[PDB]
Amino acid sequence: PIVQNLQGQMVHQAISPRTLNAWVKVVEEKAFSPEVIPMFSALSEGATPQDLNTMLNTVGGHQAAMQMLKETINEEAAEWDRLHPVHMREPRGSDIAGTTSTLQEQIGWMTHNPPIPVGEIYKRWIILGLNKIVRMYSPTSILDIRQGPKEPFRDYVDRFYKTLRAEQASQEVKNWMTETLLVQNANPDCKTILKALGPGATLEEMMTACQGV
Amino acid sequence: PIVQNLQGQMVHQAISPRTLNAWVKVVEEKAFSPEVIPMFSALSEGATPQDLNTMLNTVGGHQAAMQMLKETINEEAAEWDRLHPVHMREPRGSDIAGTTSTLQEQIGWMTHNPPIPVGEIYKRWIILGLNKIVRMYSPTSILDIRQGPKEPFRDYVDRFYKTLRAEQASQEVKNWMTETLLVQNANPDCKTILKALGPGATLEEMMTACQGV
Amino acid sequence: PIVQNLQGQMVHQAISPRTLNAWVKVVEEKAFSPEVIPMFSALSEGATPQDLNTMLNTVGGHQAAMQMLKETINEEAAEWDRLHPVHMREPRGSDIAGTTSTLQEQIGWMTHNPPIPVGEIYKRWIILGLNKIVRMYSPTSILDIRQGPKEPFRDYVDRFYKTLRAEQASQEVKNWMTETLLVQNANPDCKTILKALGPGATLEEMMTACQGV
Amino acid sequence: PIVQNLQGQMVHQAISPRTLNAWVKVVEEKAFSPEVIPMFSALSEGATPQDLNTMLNTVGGHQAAMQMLKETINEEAAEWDRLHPVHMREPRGSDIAGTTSTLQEQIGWMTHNPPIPVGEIYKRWIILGLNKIVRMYSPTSILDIRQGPKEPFRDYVDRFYKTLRAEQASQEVKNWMTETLLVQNANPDCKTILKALGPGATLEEMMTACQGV
Amino acid sequence: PIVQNLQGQMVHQAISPRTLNAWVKVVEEKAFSPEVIPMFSALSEGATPQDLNTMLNTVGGHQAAMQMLKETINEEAAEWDRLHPVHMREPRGSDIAGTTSTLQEQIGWMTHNPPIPVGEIYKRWIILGLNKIVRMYSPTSILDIRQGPKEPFRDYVDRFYKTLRAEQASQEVKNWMTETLLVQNANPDCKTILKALGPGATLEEMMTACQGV
Amino acid sequence: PIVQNLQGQMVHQAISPRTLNAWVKVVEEKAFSPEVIPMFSALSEGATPQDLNTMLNTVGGHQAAMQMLKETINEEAAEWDRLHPVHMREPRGSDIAGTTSTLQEQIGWMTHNPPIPVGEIYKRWIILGLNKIVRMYSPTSILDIRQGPKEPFRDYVDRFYKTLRAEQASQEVKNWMTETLLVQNANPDCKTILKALGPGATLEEMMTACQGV
Amino acid sequence: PVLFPGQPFGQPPL
Amino acid sequence: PVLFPGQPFGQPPL
Amino acid sequence: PVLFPGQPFGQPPL
Amino acid sequence: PVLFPGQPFGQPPL
Amino acid sequence: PVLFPGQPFGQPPL
Amino acid sequence: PVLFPGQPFGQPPL
């Protein structure tokens, strides 16, 4: 991250070994479960591009996925270079990605007036690449999810919303899915109870009713 | 949380990986035992809305429960928008929930004069949603709890008060429950001893007597 | 606890997750062994009432015992309200217990001139309730403790003083107990050696002699 | 690393035992997997030459590899002495390696105006020696990697890019490899699908197609 | 310990839970091995009497030993009251032991001009009591230690000096012991080699020779 | 170590329990493997003599070795008293060893103008004693090391250089050893390959060739 | 009373 | 509503 | 005496 | 492109 | 000598 | 050379 030094100037704070080891543990154990993106985003709060790159280089495994992430940063940084032509100097996509930008340039922009938040901009590109990885590591679309004939409705809801979280679909599609597929793919008894609640029932009401099956 | 920077201004403190990993451990192991709410509240001391949201996004599992929590934040933030019409600017419900509010707006309100404590306000809504989850994750009402025919009275008390903690009922109902059901549902011998103490006996007296059975 | 902020004013320090997790571990594993009271008192050094309450709420288990602790804080805070009638304002018992007192009122009193140490006062009430719990969780009075016919005298001493620590009796009774019961309840050979030392022997002398049996 | 002291001067910060123990764990467990170089580089952020040397001396095992690293620092420091003849004084190769340079000379250069970053310069030589070790600890060239007849294409990609990371070849060779060998060495069905995509397909497209086999 | 507060005054630092848990681990596992005294002394660097008392109260087990430690603090504090009659005020033995002295009096004396180091004085009394415990927990005097007929001389030396460390005897007796008993109680072959070295041989020489047996 | 206090003066920093526990773990597990000396030297960065002594006293085990270390500090401190006759005052050998020097005298010298670095001087004597221990704990001289008839050459190199690290011999002897014994004691096939490289081959070349056997 | 049976510690009254 | 079904918490709208 | 048998260490007297 | 296939992240070009 | 056989390290003499 | 075979890293020469 960045901090004020005791000399009264903005200076880099290096990543703690506990933060790097946490990120290793996260990526090793959770293997791009969707929770890895908020976990990454928490571990990389205030990160400069060099800090982000040090996290990504440390992963070691999953190199096919890390290449899909590099393909994403390629096209996102090219899109930045397209949307922001060249005239501190303004950062190019390779500056935001931390390749052509020194650490001191990164801190310079992140503390400019107004700031250019190259750490956050690059972190958006990484998070978007992790999103593509997370879909392709999901085994099932939400359309595949159906309640087991004796599966508790709370466990089916947990499967459904955990899948819906990985989906992709635009937000109004996720509204239609949580209204419609959640009912449509229940077991016949719970399905009948849900339809008896009417279409506007909240998840709390739906669970409270179908717990009785 | 929020801290004074060495430059002499109020600035964000990022969540430590140990606090996030603690929250993950808590929610993974304790699965909304009622103790999860004070544990959450301790881990989120001084939290901005972005800090709270980072904790909740990190949970990963229990997605049916996390949706019940989002249903709660929906209705609570709508109730805020109802109780506080629009005229720093005043926060809307989506500002307090940290969706339409930048981190700098959150710190601005949390350090205003007088402050508007958007972190604490939102934390109340989250804690209320966790309360709804905690009831629905409780398997039994206090009315279901009866002492086993040879169960030690201290163990029955522990079952009873652990259930009463999850109840819901208003405080005067919890008074009536701890006076009446606690006696009424004891084993016949301990039940007889308790009635022989009279109705006003303290829990210490009740335990000290019924330990003799 | 409380600390000086970098702005030059007294401000709350939140409880670390390691302190809360330590307190959970302590109460989960040690289940009100008498050592839990000094351990609690060390973990709650400089604690405000809100800090103490966050520790107690986090316990989760042992709810019958935590109710006996609430019965104690009830009568102790009522006794405070009796001994200190109402006229910063002076704290009522519900202020010291942290229910009717904001955190800022707690820090106000804890940094007043002279201070009113509402954190320490409340911590005395909690420690007294934990003392009542500790006796009732002790299975045996000191009068029950007798040396096994081939038990090493050092192990009998360890059992005796560990029980005497939980006792309750006033200090001059504990003097009489360590002079009299310690001899009276030894095995016949060690008992004879101890009586041969005379009544004033120190524990070091007693152990050094009875090690020869 | 280096920090500002409270006296207002640049002063050494000693390596934490957690950083040294982390480096020991890394080198003991990961045995010069290519990830060890970014992991080393993260653990040695802002390191003086004495700091780097303390990390390398602590390794203990792998002494044949640590000698190959000393052979590398020999030739790199000799090349420095060749490229930078002698005229603070300018550092010789033995000064940058931290042998003939005191810690105070190292901090002097690292805080000079302009700085001479002897810590970073030496860290480049160490990282280059670790690169030679990493190739020789790799068992296979990328040319050896072929997809198993029923191996999932995602697992073959992971093997391929993990090997390509250790390669050595210049960047345009790695471009040719990821375009050509990745297709050429797939299983016959996936190989046919890949050729049906055309030569410009991205790794995401390639995986998405060959997942259907 | 004691620290300078940010307000510019000397103020207590509370014991960390890691230091208390370390002390618990030490006393639980090592059970007054002689190493427990330097370990205690390191953990209690700069400790006030209240800090020391919090460490000792936390022990929980070994209560016969902790009573022998209280017998020692009784006689040592009485000896202080004898050597230092009464005239800040001067501390009595009960002030140094932290019973009649507030924490603020303890810090007052520990920061007086000249200081009265009541923390260190009391820590001497505790360390002396721990010494009495350590002898009585040692099973053997140095006179009992003899080399096993095929025991390696390095292992006999380790047994001998580990016992000599617990001894008690005055320093010139420990000189005579390490010169004389170390030879006298070796196995006959090593014993013959040692006598062939002459009486002034150093432990390095003795080991280097007797390694050949 | 030593630090600047917030009052603006040089003051002791106590050893963390994690540093002491790390040193215990190191000496308990690694039992004077040569890596223990750099590990000790890292853990004791900036250590005063009292700090070093607290580390050494904490070891507990290996007391025969710790006596060989005391024999070394005896002769080294006597040699200091010989090389530096008596005239702040100048430190005697017993001052540098921290026996006759208070902590305040140690910090006085370590912050004098020019400083007398009694911490580093004493740490040299300890490191020299640890060197004598490390040789005597090594089971084999480098002359004993021969490649197993089917042992991989990389594993023989690792055995050889790990032994050479413990040797003792002066640096030009270690040059002759790594040139000559490394070849001379290889298996006959690898030995033939090495001789076919010529005498000046680097370890990288030697390994790269003999990997083909 | 200051703390009632079912309530958490530090629960504000009413 | 302020948080929709599939979205993370703290997701900015639109 | 300064510390009596059953008491904790640092117990204030009376 | 900004990152090429075999390279680490944050590798300076050329 | 500066450290005698049985003594701890840093033991003050006499 | 700057580091010789048996020596630790950072060993001062001579």
Numbering used by the authors:
A (entry chain A), B (entry chain A), C (entry chain A), D (entry chain A), E (entry chain A), F (entry chain A): 1 to 87, 96 to 221
G (entry chain B), H (entry chain B), I (entry chain B), J (entry chain B), K (entry chain B), L (entry chain B): 313 to 326
What does the paper say about this structure?
pmcThe mature HIV-1 capsid is a conical, fullerene shell that encompasses the viral genome. It is constructed of a lattice of approximately 200 capsid protein (CA) hexamers incorporating CA pentamers at 12 highly curved vertices. The surface of the conical capsid is dense in protein-binding sites that mediate interactions with host machinery necessary for transport of the capsid through the cytoplasm into the nucleus. Here, we present structures at 2.6 to 3.5 Å resolution of CA hexamers and pentamers within in vitro assembled conical CA-IP6 polyhedra from multiple lattice contexts differing in local curvature and geometry, alone or in the presence of Nup153-, CPSF6-, or Sec24C-derived peptides.
